[model samples]
Target: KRVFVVGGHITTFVGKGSPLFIDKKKENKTLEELLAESINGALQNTGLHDGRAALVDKLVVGNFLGELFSSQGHLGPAAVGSLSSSAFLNKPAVRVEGACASGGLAVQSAWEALLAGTSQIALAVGVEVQTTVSARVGGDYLARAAHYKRQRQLDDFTFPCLFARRMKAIQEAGHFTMEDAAYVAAKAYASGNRNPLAHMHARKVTLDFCTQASDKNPNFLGNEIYKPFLRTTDCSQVSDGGAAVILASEEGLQKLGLSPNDNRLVEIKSLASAAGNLYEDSPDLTRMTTSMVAARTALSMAGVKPEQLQVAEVHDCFTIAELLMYEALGIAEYGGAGALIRSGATALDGRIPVNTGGGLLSFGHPVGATGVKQVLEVYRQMKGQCGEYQMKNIPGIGATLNMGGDDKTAVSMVLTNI
Candidate 1:
């Protein structure tokens, strides 16, 4: 009666930050087209492309602003049109929304159904094509996820400002230096250089570039972030891409003629979510309460200790976000994440490598596609599909933490190679 994901695949997380994974002619695809493309590619890679669409009892698509980003809707059924796919078969196609955590919610929907014996196979995919608009325009649409009262004031602002404010609040409280945020981000980009599917690759930046704004990296608010804080380059690259995962029940995999012996199989140890209102409780913008709550909840559900997690892929929308997650995941003490990063603890060669595929910083954050892609990296890492970025030694367990709207919502899922 257990639910599991059999396989996952991704399209290139391409960009305006850097053309990390761009194609020559196929660059201008619509949102639905991007979803369709990833659907077929994932299905085909999992041996599901050949008359396998019928087996999927449900389709849950994760998307945020299709209307604003591409002026389209009905993305559930729409996501299946690609892959020469026939698997969805007019099944219950549900579109899940939770800002950036849309894909994780899609996974939750399918996982619940599969656990309840209502579904045999489920398909969850995340798609976003925000490259058509400018970064400010994209941020304008994304800002809709913020509180309505503050939405008007945010009209000309972007997400980085909010997170930067959080960083400022945290550092002011004397937890950690914002300087370490740059280290975390740099390591991510360095890892992206090794990952073939990453949006931007082989990138290297120093702490100076991130902390102090110069020609290469500019200040957003015109002297707003203060000194030794985040800059535009210090944030996640705005990306346009798609990612999809095919999930199955224990009985579902048997029907597909797969087994525990197949290295492709990955099991979900636990999945959980938590919600918070931005500035709902504490006026302090420092910590992400939702992420902390959700991470602790999922870890407790899975009965896992932080030290046992050999790999982690947490939301790194900004350097500070990753640092905050280190504390939230209990991998590092509060305000201790910077020292941990400075010690090379989160490096690919560290005790537990993080974001071996470069994370959102180098991989690019397509919002919806990010959560799906995070688990996709876990799948690849567990199966040894990650080429240069693959670690020398990997444990059976991996963790992914996805956040919605600066920790307005957080979903943490634990995974293992079966």
Candidate 2:
């Protein structure tokens, strides 16, 4: 019942200068190109290539902002065609969109197909091209991922602004202050400084920098809420990138003549996905029910407890989101996220080590690829391939949590040593 991740690859937001950059033009590359590059890189990294290639039984892709960025709707066929490979020309490839969690959902679909004995091998990819659009348009696109009807009523609103409201709510609950939140931001940035692939690598902001107000945007003044203790660094950069992971059964692994200790073979222990209810029907604003359900189901299937997990890569689309995830993932008690952050329980060398890759705050958020990229980080870290930011003495167990669309849909997965 264990699914091994045989190979993984990613295209990050470090600009086109890195070896992973197949396309460099700002908004000039198509999602198809990015996806193809990532998949090819993954295969190459795994040393899997042949005239026939490893024919994928199912190809699942998660893309949310492709329409807004490129005005393209038929994503599955388009991305496949761009692969330009006869090996997969006739294979079934489907696109699943779940806002920011699109990538994670795609992983769930592929994993299910494999478990059902429908396929011995599958490919899951997440791709998003957001920098191609203007900031205003991008902001609008992000808004669509939220409670559109409720959010549309306000004209002067951005995603950061919305999370700012969540920050206030967290503060009102008497959890963490704005200063504590800024500390988390500082940690992410400091971590990013060590990640060469991070988008905001050189841009490290401190608690003092985040707390002070600025006049960068006329309509949006820094510290607009005047809550001195609650402000934060921008969560993540608007970016374009793709990530891919290849899944195979034990039979498939043996058929390919790969060793269990192979750097690429990270096991997929358990996975769960849940669809969120309509915005009006759901009343809870402080937590995501879908996330809680997915997390519990995944943990149950893995036969592991939260404390057994050595590392995790979560959906931190915003700083506050990371705070809430600590509770959602059972790392802390409800409303105890701030205490965990202040106690250094979630830092790079902390107990759980959440988002060691700087998360979305320092890592770039490319809509479609974010989830898969998160999994890739886990794959590398567990394999002991992580260079500088590597967590020492890993437990061989890792997890990823990806949520989409105002927390309406969520996908959580646990991976362990083979």
Which candidate should be chosen as best, given TM-score against the real structure? 1
Give all candidate RMSDs, comma-separated.
2.2, 3.3
Residues forming the 10-long window of minimal summed lDDT in candidate 2: 214-223
lDDT of 1 by residue, 179-249 (tens): 77778877887788887667778466676775565667766553344433566656787788889898888
lDDT of 2 by residue, 1-418 (tens): 5688987788756433233444534445567777778877777766666544646687888899777777766677765554473466667788898888999988988888888877768888888887665576677788777777776444333566656666667677776666666667777778877787787776675467754464431224243562332343645567777888888887667777776667657888888988876465345556767888899899898788888888888888877778777777877787767787878868778887877878887777887888898899988888776678887877588898998866677889998876
Assess every candidate by TM-score. Answer: 0.94, 0.90
In every candidate, how many clashes are there? Answer: 5, 4
lDDT of each: 0.78, 0.74
lDDT comparing candidate 2 with the true structure: 0.74
Model 2 TM-score (2 dp): 0.90
In model 2, pairs of residues that clash are: 178-229, 178-230, 179-229, 235-361
